[PDB]
Amino acid sequence: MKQDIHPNYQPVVFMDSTTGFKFLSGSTKGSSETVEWEDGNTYPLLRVEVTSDSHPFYTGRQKFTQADGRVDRFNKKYGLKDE
Amino acid sequence: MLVPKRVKHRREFRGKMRGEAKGGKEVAFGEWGLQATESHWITNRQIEAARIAMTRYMKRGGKVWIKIFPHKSYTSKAIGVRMGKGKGAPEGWVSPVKRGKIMFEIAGVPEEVAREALRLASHKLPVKTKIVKREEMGGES
Amino acid sequence: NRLKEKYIKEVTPSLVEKFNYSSVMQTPKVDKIVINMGVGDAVSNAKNLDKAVEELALITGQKPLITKAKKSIAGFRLREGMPIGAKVTLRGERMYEFLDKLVTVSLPRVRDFHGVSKKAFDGRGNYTLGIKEQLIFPEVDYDLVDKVRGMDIVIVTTANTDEESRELLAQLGMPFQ
Amino acid sequence: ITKPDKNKTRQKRHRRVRNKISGTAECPRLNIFRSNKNIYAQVIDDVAGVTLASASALDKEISGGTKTETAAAVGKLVAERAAEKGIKKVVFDRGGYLYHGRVQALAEAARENGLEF
Amino acid sequence: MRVNITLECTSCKERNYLTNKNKRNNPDRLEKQKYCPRERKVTLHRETK
Amino acid sequence: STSNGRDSESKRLGAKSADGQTVTGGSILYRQRGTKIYPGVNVGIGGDDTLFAKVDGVVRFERKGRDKKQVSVYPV
Amino acid sequence: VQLEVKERAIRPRSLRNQLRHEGKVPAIVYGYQIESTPIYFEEKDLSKILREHGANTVIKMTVDGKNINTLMSKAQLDTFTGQMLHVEFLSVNM
RNA sequence: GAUGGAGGUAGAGCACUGUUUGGACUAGGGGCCCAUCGGGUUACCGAAUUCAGAUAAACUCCGAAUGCCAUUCAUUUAU
RNA sequence: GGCGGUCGCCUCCUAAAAGGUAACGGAGGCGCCCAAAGGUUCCCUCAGAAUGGUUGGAAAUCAUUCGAAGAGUGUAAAGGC
RNA sequence: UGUGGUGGCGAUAGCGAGAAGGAUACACCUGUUCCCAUGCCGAACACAGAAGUUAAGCUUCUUAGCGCCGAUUGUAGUGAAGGGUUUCCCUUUGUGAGAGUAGGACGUCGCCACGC
Ligand SMILES: [Zn+2]
Structure with a gap:
């Protein structure tokens, strides 16, 4: 680490609509809101909308949409009409 | 006037040779081969005519390798030019053959075809040729 | 760090x-x-690194270096000494901070996601993770970033084969497919 | 990834340095050795290769820790044992390192206590 | 573009040395600290004019 | 009408003092062009790689293993 | 098996030029049993075994006693005459 | 006559530069792929790659006979 | 003889393994550049090839591995490093 | 004895492939406040120490796949002396390579400290 040639950085709290994953750092700062012990006396300005759970991939693939029923189209729309 | 073989040179005027003697270079691949027994050059054409007169009285191909190739270049002046100024233009090619060397080699046909062809060929070269076969080893392979 | x-x-x-x-x-x-x-455009317009290095300083925590040209190519119009690329190396805890960023916030900001390609083995395990854009990280803003450059992350390990590295990175994020 | 075995590079720099002067006729050589924990020294001659006086970081007699303390101590011991046999024209072999105190403090300790560079 | 040039002592006024430069790389008179023989002491030398 | 027949002068390289000879201080030993014979005991190299002697004495050529050769002067 | 094997001279002078005009082959043997001694041979003797046996059978040298099982290694003969020169032998054990 | 040395000649040799003839192969290209993914097919071949076999004045991993330079050396001779 | 070409300097070959050696013999360059491309004291090792990786192209920057030299040396070629 | 350091001798000492080890020693490693450092980066270099470990380096041992050193022979070539065609060849006399190859070889010698 040299001097005067490295930008700002602080252990800014990360957060989201859930999960309070308040441990990481960053380089964007501002209005102080979380000076707390359990984490860094820092900022939750990072209110990213991805918990690493929004995209159901780290929470595993969900059934968020289907997008599954093409066969019943002929087999239910006039297939309810069938039987 | 047909061009059998040539090269890519890197040099044009080469000092004319000096041929002394040789021994070795026995049969390599085929079963029947020539053997020049003198000291002389050999032009491009002579080898070409030899290859033709071997192919024709052969048939169905039969393995035939041309175990020599012109490398060195040639030169000449024009008639009516007094001696003097720098070397003349280059025209031709030549690869000198000492005695003992082996020019051609064949296999794939019984001797009668072989000696037929390899006596037809030896009338196109200024060398006193001979005839030898692929002889013997500790392992023929 | 955690x-x-x-x-x-x-x-x-x-x-x-x-x-x-x-x-x-x-281990x-x-x-x-x-x-x-x-x-790759300084030879054309040297007024692009002027912002590339900035966006970098924002992504990492340090200002990058500036790689030279090292040779000369006409179809490219390359002369030696010209700058084309700018890099940073990550060590120490910042490694883990930035990788946490990647696995936890950065990666899941990329549209139409399946995960990382399963094939960057190299037979010696130094997996890379190409990126198209640079609007991903929250350290970057809409009306301030005006290009679509990318980086080439080159993570290195001490593994010899690729399965060890794979199932290691599995333990440390890396949402594969 | 491999790691370059650090003693090798210092060996190479040593071999380049040594190429300037050993000259260990009657103005015999000095020496130096690092480690993770200790420091050693010998006063060597050529062509014999037979040293004349030695010392030891933590093998004979010292006070402090692996630093100038140990360094200066060893240097004092070297210079004392040297003038015993009457040597005042050592040629200092840098080894393959620099001057920053584990070698430099050793050096100047060797100087004052009675050896001439 | 190159020119044979003569340095000269800034104190004793002796044209002591001779050398050459590129009159468009370095368009300013040179200043080197050569050694004068007339007084046996280093002396700021300046290009002739 | 040629464009040849251009030549330089000779420069007369080649050793100028054999072995077992008694060489006085200063003499030349083996005029080179680039290093072909590394110098040795009391032998010094000049600007154009020539090899002179520093002390009076006798010459002997030897070898440095596989690399190259040497000259040196062992005074009496 | 009971052959024409005898002695020779170290570096004999142009006595060799005539050795090639009167039917002689300067031959050699160096190997395991006994170290190295130049040794005679000509062209008609061994071709008997060659035709009878072939091209690699165990060849034995004699002073009418124990044998040297030579395994003749290389002989690239002087061309333009089709006759043997420089027969470089070799000898191994069982 | 004896001993020590400098140097790349006549050989001959493919380690480098050139020149080069066959065998294998795939590196995959060669007009299509054969086709509106299974192998790119017939064919061309260089290198990646190899197995043999050739040649050089401005090619050398090597290299004599001779001359040449020296010696508080020896024997005859006489410059 | 003329008409053509050449007239000084450096490198290779011819040159017959000390040095020297012609030809209107076979091949190339020179009539400068550099205030650092010098002096000194520290430190470092190349061309490639394979394998991965946005724009990226067969060929830019990167990363890993193999690599005695196949690089580089202001300028022509030998000899060096 | 072993381990560390430090020199000579043509790589016959090397390359490659495989096993063993940690008391001391060496090293890996724990860190940056401190002299010092990064054309960004305690990786490098420099400093502060001993949590942990022989995985690696590292030293001991095995191996003729590769790299190297190779005799005695034969053959090419050649000084001197001759003889034929004089493009070339041949014979006495003195010397005699390169290729090929038996074989050797997984070092030898010297010093200083430590303790078992
Ligand atoms: Zn003055």
């Missing part, structure tokens, strides 16, 4: 199991991370 904790408390015993090292020293680690922002 990773180092999680690392020395979970990764070491699990991996010591899955291969039975005669010594814990035999496959993570060594460094290098970042590669190739402008």
